[PDB]
Amino acid sequence: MTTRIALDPFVSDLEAESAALRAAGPLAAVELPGGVPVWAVTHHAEAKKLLTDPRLVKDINVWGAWQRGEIAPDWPLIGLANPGRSMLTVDGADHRRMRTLVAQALTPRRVEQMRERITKLTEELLDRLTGEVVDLKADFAYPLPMYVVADLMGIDEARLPRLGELFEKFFSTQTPPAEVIATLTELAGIMAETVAAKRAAPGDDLTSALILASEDGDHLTDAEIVSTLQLMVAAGHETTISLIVNAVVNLSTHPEQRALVLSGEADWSSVVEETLRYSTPTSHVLIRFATEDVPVGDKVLPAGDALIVSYGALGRDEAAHGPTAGEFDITRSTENRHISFGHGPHVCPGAALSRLEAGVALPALYARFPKLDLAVPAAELRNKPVVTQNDLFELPVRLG
Numbered sequence: 001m002t003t004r005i006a007l008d009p010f011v012s013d014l015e016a017e018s019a020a021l022r023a024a025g026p027l028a029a030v031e032l033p034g035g036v037p038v039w040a041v042t043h044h045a046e047a048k049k050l051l052t053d054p055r056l057v058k059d060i061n062v063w064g065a066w067q068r069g070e071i072a073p074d075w076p077l078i079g080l081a082n083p084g085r086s087m088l089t090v091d092g093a094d095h096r097r098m099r100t101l102v103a104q105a106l107t108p109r110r111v112e113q114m115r116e117r118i119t120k121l122t123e124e125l126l127d128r129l130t131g132e133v134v135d136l137k138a139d140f141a142y143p144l145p146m147y148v149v150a151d152l153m154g155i156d157e158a159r160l161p162r163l164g165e166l167f168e169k170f171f172s173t174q175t176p177p178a179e180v181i182a183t184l185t186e187l188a189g190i191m192a193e194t195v196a197a198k199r200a201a202p203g204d205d206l207t208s209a210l211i212l213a214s215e216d217g218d219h220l221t222d223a224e225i226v227s228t229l230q231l232m233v234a235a236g237h238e239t240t241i242s243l244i245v246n247a248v249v250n251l252s253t254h255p256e257q258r259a260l261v262l263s264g265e266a267d268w269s270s271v272v273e274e275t276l277r278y279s280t281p282t283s284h285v286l287i288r289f290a291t292e293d294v295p296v297g298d299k300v301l302p303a304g305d306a307l308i309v310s311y312g313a314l315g316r317d318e319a320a321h322g323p324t325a326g327e328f329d330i331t332r333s334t335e336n337r338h339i340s341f342g343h344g345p346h347v348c349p350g351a352a353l354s355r356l357e358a359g360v361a362l363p364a365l366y367a368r369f370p371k372l373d374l375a376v377p378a379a380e381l382r383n384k385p386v387v388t389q390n391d392l393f394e395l396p397v398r399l400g
């Protein structure tokens, strides 16, 4: 068998865990919180190969352990491992069917149309900051992407506080099993009430457009629209928030590079792209399954086994980025673009939106508060117990 790395449910030392995963790769055996063994791809080149390999599918019917009844229905990760049917959980024909309209709404041109609104919201959130020291996550980095995605999907703003409480339970490794299914049921309920509303009273949002497209069949069922809405709201906020948080942390801990960006010697896109490579919001993505045995390095991923993609660990792969891969350097040149938005047919359709949001938020923040810095030592920052995401509990900032 294998060396098997149990991922820390409390995310106490992500840097060490990522390094261990690289050391064990390209195909590392891991244990997910809750005791579930899977494989992880932890090197850049091998991940790109597996992300485009037709033997590595989203279809959970390929999962041996699932078919054998080994996966608890109240596993806290069950909402990531077995979400409702959407573009996320299919390949090929059905993937094109389920992705096309959403992806079309998020092209660079269509995102550029959102710039004014995103900019106005960014500036309003900066206007509302109160006190010398703020939790910049709760007061800025969290609300901007949640308001953007909620508006895109037709979600009533009045529901956002409750959605925030449900996502906290969805993501936490520490949510009691007895609360797991109820959280999933209530989240699905909010998305279903949103679909019902936009069917009755269609607007200019993407949910309204999905419904109006699927009227004369061949497009998405209501159940698929509900799952798609949950996928969009979750994917669109969780990650973008951590991108903005991690960019501020990285500039605060690398003040010589912050000085380059504030003086115009480096551009804000370089900060966003290096944050995505060095410190991706998404440490791991669940989940793919092998239809056949697949060689990965000197190991075999057996048919019916599962694969997570360890974007966090592979972002610092020295084979891809050279001997400085383990450092934050907005000036780097790499022969290999990061793959923190994925690769192959499932590559993130929201990448342009996330880049616009961070690309507006970060210069706006530092234009308002040029002297902003962490209000605590960087070593006091703490990851939330969210094994797939690189999310902090808070971002204490002295605004200046």
Ligand code: HEM
Pocket (backbone or CB within 6 Å): 087, 088, 089, 099, 149, 231, 232, 235, 236, 237, 239, 240, 243, 280, 281, 282, 285, 309, 311, 339, 340, 341, 342, 343, 345, 346, 347, 348, 349, 350, 351, 353, 354
């Ligand atoms: C920094 C922010 C983001 C990061 C790091 C990120 C990362 C990713 C990654 C890595 C994938 C592919 C996972 C894989 O196949 O292994 C993905 C898929 C997805 N992302 Fe993003 N994402 C971000 C922002 C967004 C936003 C803003 C939206 C929506 C508005 C979004 C919507 C989605 C959807 C719908 C998928 C599924 C695509 C499919 O499976 O065909 N993401 N994202």
Ligand SMILES: C[C@]12CC[C@H]3[C@@H](CCC4=CC(=O)CC[C@@]43C)[C@@H]1CC[C@@H]2O
Pocket (backbone or CB within 6 Å): 079, 080, 083, 084, 088, 230, 231, 232, 234, 235, 238, 239, 282, 285, 286, 388
């Ligand atoms: C599963 C899910 C859709 C896919 C999301 C997931 C949150 C984590 C996540 C982060 C990524 O970078 C890719 C998309 C995913 C994997 C969402 C939580 C609820 C939603 O149904």
